[PDB]
Design a protein around this ligand. Structure first.
Ligand SMILES: *[C@@H]1O[C@H](CO)[C@@H](O)[C@H](O)[C@H]1NC(C)=O
Ligand SMILES: *[C@@H]1O[C@H](CO)[C@@H](O)[C@H](O)[C@H]1NC(C)=O
Ligand SMILES: *[C@@H]1O[C@H](CO)[C@@H](O)[C@H](O)[C@H]1NC(C)=O
Ligand SMILES: *[C@@H]1O[C@H](CO)[C@@H](O)[C@H](O)[C@H]1NC(C)=O
Ligand SMILES: [Mg+2]
Ligand SMILES: [Mg+2]
Lengths: 203, 213, 212, 214, 212, 195
């Protein structure tokens, strides 16, 4: 979708908006048999052709042939924390996906699914808490960008997931943070190379 | 001003290894990731790897892990890439480039490249021959040499405009190249045009004055 | 890895007109992509970063936009020094990956090749081989043929061809074609000729000599 | 300075006559015998006669008594020789010369000569052609003209050294002549060399630039 | 009349040597005789009068002596601008009479002719005739031959020859030869050759072209 | 060219104290004579049995004999006859005079005792005068009745027809003219003179 959006609803962009049933675009763009083109009269502009149940421009749960897809047809792929979208058979919208179970692996293994979201840490999966590994002194560790866990409210125990402690839960595999995540006690950010880049004070 | 100066062209036998170097100046060497990129003639860019000169921490493309080794001398602000167990598929131009504008870095400055050639073939000097027939075009034939490059200038670089040097063509372990200069009929013969050919790998230098047939 | 495609592969535009290159990512990289220009025999040169943002010392006629999977680099007013190959590169995860590049051609008025033939040098004949060199110089558009005839007869063996990239002042293309013989096989024959075939003529351009 | 300036070249039909003049300046015209001398191409001097401009008294070689008539205009300080009943044997150059150093006079000052040509042949202009192939030789061909002379210069007289103009050769009532200039290969073609031919008798003038040929 | 003979007819001498021209009168003329020099295309120039006596503005290397029937003009010593014909003339009685002259050649080192051949011009070919001209320039000594060959065959008809006098700077001789043809007969043949024969080679100098 | 003249043996010119002179040894073609490179008193003397030498004069033969008496050794002068040999010497003896009042010096004067003198006027018993001021006639020979200068006229006049038959005799170039005011040039004009 290259370039700025007009951010004004108009009948003729591909998008359905208040006061219009469908929108397949202006005549030159509209491959829809279900719908009336933007350069076509008001009052039909913007509205479903009669006897036509729905338009694919309203959503994925309409067929090309202007029928509602039947219930439990796939309208959306799995997310990290969510299962397939299925059509409900009464609308062309793809209804909200349902959640995968809590403590399912999310965000490149980094956090965990709670109520269909991404939150918290893969630490909490094992009943640990996420901490920050922190500097010996002024001097930047690789472990600054590791996922680091501690025993709950005992920050003394902070260590990298791959450390010799936590071997029970993580077996010596380091798990790195996601690029962009804060590091060295919010003095930094992780770059693509998983180094902690110092960042300005006083923002 | 930020600049990265690279070592010059390598010829290397199959099975051997090379050490390519990149010298940084103009900034603090130890504050920037330094990256290496391969390009085969003429074709796509391919990211080899990166090293962080402070602690020498290195990231490698999986494809190159068994190929390339990255090091730094922090004192000389120089980066090195060793290419080992060299095969012909390793013949390529290799750039170093500085990573900048975090956190997902562009490559903001580049070396000139180092051209690596992997061949069993032995170094040979070019023979140089004159090419002579309102404007007139003359040339030089530069024949039967190895490896690339050669340089060709005319009248020590006083002729520049008028000049095509053609890309070299490989047949049976030797290159042939030609170069072409067009001058008005008023200077030639009356004033002289001479090509200057140099082939650094043999330290050959030839001047040839072009003369009418 | 994250993969990039570029469209189209080559692109052809008149000076002062506008051109737009397209880059497709195989998953959502956000804005983390950058654009490079490589002129012939040159290093890559950073044009745009992140994918709208300007680089100090880059001409302003270079711009970009895009986000998610789709990105565009644009030159609003093309000049002829903008002949180059243009690459998108993603920084979103390493290993960093490049699109395969789009080449820019600049259109100009048609030109017929200037064709020159050259006989073997004195030196080379005393040395025991013979090379005839044909240039076909400064033509547009790009596509051409060369043919060789010895004493009226078309010789396909011993012919080594080389083509230049587009010229940044001239906007043209040149080609050399080199025919290589033993002094003996050369000295069998008499009239040596090379012929160019290009759009700017119905009939081939012929240059020739006799051995003297 | 003592000078005898003679009239220019005459063409004349058989049986006609010509009046040749010699204008004296630089001395007292009436103090010296003035003499006329014939020379056929290239051959001896032949004394025709003398006149004394004070009283117009004349002496004639017996050979020329039926040919030549000598007079002077004393006002204009000019002498005249009439040649009449013209045959081909009269085609020749004719000098006036001042007689000096008595009593047996040398001829101490001469005119340039006037060339008389006696023929039935009709005046014709030359065709002029370029002659083109460390030094290089070019030329002009001046072909098929009548009568003599023609003049040839190169670059309006900017080339002088380097130049042979050949003596004209007569076949069938036309002359041919050639001119030859040798210049270094550096100026030519690069700078222009032009031959300028003039044939005063027809008032023809031709410039020809020499240029390299196939 | 009183008659004069001059001996010899021509005389040839190296510069800086001494030369003496001789004049015989058919009766005793005493001293009344005078000497004149005529250069090429020149007027006669009075050298000596009465026959030892000098003329103002005459170079002093010119002298004369004799009396009665026998007289000598002497140059001591010769320079190369002294190339000319020298005449005696008697004033003793009129009609005045001239000896038939002696020509002076000045000897120099041998020179081979520079031979140039020229083809018919465009103008002349459009006019319906064709001329080939050969120059044989700046040679010494004087004697020379030309032959013309058309495609190898010796051509005597249509050939016009011209010779310069000796050059006063150069001391040399030049010659032109003009072969003159119909455009038709010229366009019958292919190779045109002028060939020069001079003392300075055993074998003739050949210049040629082909009709192109 | 100039004569030496010094007597020496030899120049080829016979002089006092020498009988003949043929030259030095490589000049001497004379079979009659001893060359100058011979010993003193063969020097320049006749070889024996040889009567004379052609170097002495024209009246000796190439073979060293005297030429016989009536043989010609010398040409007509104006005023003198052919020289004849006398048969006893090799010198050509002085010629005899041509008759008195034979025309000499282009009919200008007369032979008397074999010299050339006076005027052609005297031939006819006139005397020479100068014509004086017709301008041409200044260079004519002019005659007068003897001591009657009024009667002066040019040889070519009507008046002298008896003697000169109307044929003009011009003076020789160089002659004084117009009563010694002038000289005649080759063209027979009288050129004014001053001293
Ligand atoms: C997942 O997380 C929250 C927080 O403990 C829990 O209360 C919620 O009910 C969980 N999801 C389910 C299945 O209830
Ligand atoms: C770094 O380079 C310098 C050259 O100036 C050299 O002296 C030094 O030993 C190098 N360091 C290492 C570890 O080789
Ligand atoms: C002499 O020449 C002049 C010309 O200036 C002329 O006026 C005059 O009539 C001429 N005299 C004769 C006798 O022809
Ligand atoms: C010649 O004339 C002179 C003078 O009258 C005279 O003495 C002499 O005898 C003459 N000669 C002859 C041969 O009569
Ligand atoms: Mg809308
Ligand atoms: Mg003597």
């Amino acid at each position: 979708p290259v370039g700025l959006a007009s951010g004004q609803p108009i009948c003729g962009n591909g998008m359905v908006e208040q006061g219009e049933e469908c929108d397949c675009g202006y005549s030159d763009q509209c491959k829809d048999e279900c719908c009336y083109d933007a350069n076509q009269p008001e009052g039909k502009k913007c509205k479903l052709k009669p006897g036509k149940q729905c338009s694919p421009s309203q959503g994925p749960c309409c067929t090309a042939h202007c029928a509602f897809k039947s219930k439990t047809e796939k309208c959306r792929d799995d997310s990290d924390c969510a299962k397939e979208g299925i059509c409900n058979g009464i609308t062309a919208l793809c209804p909200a996906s349902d959640p995968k179970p809590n403590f399912t692996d999310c965000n490149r293994h980094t956090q965990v699914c709670i109520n269909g979201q991404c939150a918290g840490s893969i630490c909490e999966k094992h009943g640990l808490e996420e901490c920050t590994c922190a500097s010996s002194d002024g001097k930047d560790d690789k472990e600054l960008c590791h996922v680091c866990c501690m025993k709950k409210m005992e920050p003394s125990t902070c260590a990298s997931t791959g450390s010799v402690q936590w071997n029970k839960y993580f077996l010596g595999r380091t798990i790195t943070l996601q690029p962009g995540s804060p590091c060295n006690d919010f003095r930094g950010y992780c770059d693509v190379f998983m180094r902690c880049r110092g960042s300005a004070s006083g923002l | 001003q930020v600049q990265l100066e690279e070592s010059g062209a390598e010829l290397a036998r199959p099975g051997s290894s090379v050490k390519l170097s990149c010298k940084a100046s103009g900034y603090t060497f130890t504050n920037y990731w330094l990256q290496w990129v391969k390009q085969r003639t003429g074709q796509g860019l391919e990211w080899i790897g990166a090293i962080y000169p402070r602690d020498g921490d290195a990231k490698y493309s999986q494809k190159f892990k068994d190929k390339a080794s990255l090091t730094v001398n922090e004192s000389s602000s120089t980066a090195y890439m060793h290419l080992s167990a060299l095969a012909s598929e390793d013949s390529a131009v290799y750039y170093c480039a500085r990573a900048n504008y975090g956190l997902y870095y562009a490559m903001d400055r580049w070396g000139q490249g180092t051209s690596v050639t992997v061949s069993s073939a032995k170094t040979t000097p070019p023979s140089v021959y004159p090419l002579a027939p309102s404007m007139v075009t003359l040339g030089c034939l530069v024949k039967g040499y190895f490896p690339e490059p050669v340089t060709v200038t005319w009248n020590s670089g006083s002729l520049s405009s008028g000049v095509h040097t053609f890309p070299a063509v490989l047949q049976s372990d030797l290159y042939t190249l030609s170069s072409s200069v067009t001058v008005p009929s008023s200077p030639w013969p009356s004033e002289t045009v001479t090509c200057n050919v140099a082939h650094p790998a043999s330290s050959t230098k030839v001047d040839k004055k072009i003369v009418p047939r | 890895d994250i993969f990039l495609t570029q469209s189209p592969a080559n692109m052809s535009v008149s000076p002062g007109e506008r051109v737009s290159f397209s880059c497709r990512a195989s998953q959502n990289i956000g804005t983390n992509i950058h654009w490079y220009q490589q002129r012939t025999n040159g290093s890559p040169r950073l044009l745009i970063k992140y994918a709208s943002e300007s680089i100090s010392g880059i001409p302003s006629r270079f711009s970009g936009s895009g986000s998610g999977t789709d990105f565009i680099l644009s030159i609003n007013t093309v000049e002829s020094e903008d002949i180059a190959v243009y690459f998108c590169q993603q920084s979103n995860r390493w290993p960093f990956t490049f699109g395969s590049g789009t080449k820019l051609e600049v259109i100009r008025a048609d030109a017929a090749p200037t064709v020159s033939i050259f006989p073997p040098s004195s030196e080379q004949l005393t040395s025991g081989g013979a090379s005839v060199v044909c240039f076909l110089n400064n033509f547009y558009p790009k596509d051409i043929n060369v043919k060789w005839k010895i004493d009226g007869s078309e010789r396909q063996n011993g012919v080594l061809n080389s083509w230049t990239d587009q010229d940044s002042k001239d906007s043209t293309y040149s080609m050399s074609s080199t025919l290589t013989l033993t002094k003996d096989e050369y000295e069998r024959h008499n009239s040596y000729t090379c012929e160019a075939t290009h759009k700017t003529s119905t009939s081939p351009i012929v240059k020739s000599f006799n051995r003297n």
